[PDB]
């Protein structure tokens, strides 16, 4: 299985997540209101691990200048197509340097959990702090805390769009201090026939203290609020 968000997996991302019920329009509106709460006059936003650019496409309608960073070229391609007039960088949230700062730096949908341990987490928070304006805000949607993760969780759904049926089923286990989530897809359409795809990801179960440590090492005050877009809450941090 792949772990790199590429190929047909990357192609099926938007369809499966929309079918699961993810509402990027609501999420972007919530996020713009969160940002303006901590930074009333905020005018620009860097979305880190922006994936297919779905958040940016909507954040564009609340913020004058949006920008992305994304490690997977195949995810980035879809995002650039969707956000043709924004700058979207190919790069790595651990070690990136855009030479500018934004009112908000966001990292959504637990993309932070692709990092391996405290050192990587710390390095990414430090980069997020390096790209935020002095009156701005950094927003990170965490993965589950270890005590709130349910090993053995099964998600299964099937959606169809434009002649094609796509079933996605995931199963998750605890693997050391991370979730191993294994995801299988069957994709069937009249002319193309049926194929099976798979991916597999390790998503780190950082504790609240570990996120907090990373924010604080970056010069950011930190606040957690439970709930948020995926039930995992949101951290925000403010420089100074």
Ligand X SMILES: Nc1ncnc2c1ncn2[C@@H]1O[C@H](CSCC[C@H](N)C(=O)O)[C@@H](O)[C@H]1O
Ligand Y SMILES: Cc1cn([C@H]2C[C@H](O)[C@@H](COP(=O)(O)OP(=O)(O)O[C@H]3O[C@H](C)[C@@H](O)[C@H](N)[C@H]3O)O2)c(=O)[nH]c1=O
Q: Binding site residues for S-adenosyl-L-methionine, as ranges?
A: 5, 13, 24, 49-50, 70, 92-93, 108
Crossing angle for the helix pair 118-130 and 208-217, to the nearest 10 degrees: 40
Regarding 108 and contact with ligand X (CB under 6 A), the answer is yes
Q: Which residues fall in the annotated binding site?
A: 5, 13, 24, 49-50, 70, 92-93, 108
CA distance 60 to 50: 13
Q: Is 153 in the site for its own copies (CB under 8 A)?
A: yes
Beta strands in 115-163 (DSSP E): 132-140, 154-161
H or E stretch including 72? none
Does 49 sit near ligand X (CB under 6 A)?
yes
Partner whose binding site includes residue 108, from ligand Y, ligand X, its own copies, none (CB under 5 to 8 Å by kind): ligand X
Q: How far is the CB of 149 from ligand Y (least distance, A)?
A: 4
- Token pair 């999420």: residue: 27
109 lies in the site for ligand X, by CB under 6 A: yes
Residue 97 found at the interface with ligand Y (CB under 6 A): no
Q: Which of 15, 77, 123, 186 touches its own copies (CB under 8 A)?
A: 186
Nearest to 187 by CA among 5, 4, 3, 8: 8
Single out the residue of 30, 182, 202, 213 in contact with its own copies (rule: CB under 8 A).
182
Q: Tokens 């209101």 — which residue?
A: 33
**Cβ-contact 185, 168 below 8 angstroms:** yes
Strand order from edge to edge, sheet including 178-189: 154-161, 164-175, 178-189, 193-204
Beta carbon nearer to ligand Y, 13 or 128: 13
Question: Do 12 and 184 meet the contact criterion of CB atoms below 8 Å apart?
Answer: no
Residues within the interface to ligand Y (CB under 6 A): 17, 20, 109-111, 144, 149-150, 153, 155, 170, 172, 179, 181, 183, 201, 230-231
Residues within the interface to its own copies (CB under 8 A): 151-154, 156-158, 160, 165, 167, 169-171, 173, 182, 184, 186, 188-191, 193-194, 196, 198
């Amino acid at each position: 299985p792949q772990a790199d968000y590429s190929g047909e997996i990357a192609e099926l991302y938007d369809l499966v997540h929309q079918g699961k019920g993810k509402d990027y329009h609501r999420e972007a509106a919530d996020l713009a209101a969160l940002v303006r709460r901590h930074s009333p006059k905020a005018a620009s936003l860097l979305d880190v691990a922006c994936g297919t650019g779905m958040h940016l496409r909507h954040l564009a309608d609340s913020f004058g200048t949006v920008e992305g960073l994304e490690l997977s070229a195949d995810m980035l391609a879809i995002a650039r197509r969707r956000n043709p007039d924004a700058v979207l960088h190919h790069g790595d949230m651990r070690d990136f340097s855009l030479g500018r700062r934004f009112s908000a730096v966001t990292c959504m949908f637990s993309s932070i959990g692709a990092l391996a341990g405290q050192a990587e987490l710390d390095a990414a928070l430090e980069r997020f702090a390096a790209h935020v304006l002095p009156d701005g805000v950094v927003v990170v949607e965490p993965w589950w805390f270890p005590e709130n993760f349910t090993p053995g969780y099964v998600a299964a759904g099937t959606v169809e769009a434009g002649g094609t049926t796509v079933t996605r089923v995931s199963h998750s286990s605890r693997e050391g201090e991370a979730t191993r989530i294994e995801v299988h897809y069957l994709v069937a359409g009249p002319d193309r026939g049926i194929t099976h795809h798979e991916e597999s990801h390790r998503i780190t179960l950082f504790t609240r203290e570990q996120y907090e440590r990373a924010f604080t090492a970056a010069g950011l005050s930190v606040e957690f609020m439970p709930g948020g877009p995926s039930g995992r809450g949101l951290f925000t941090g403010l420089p100074g």
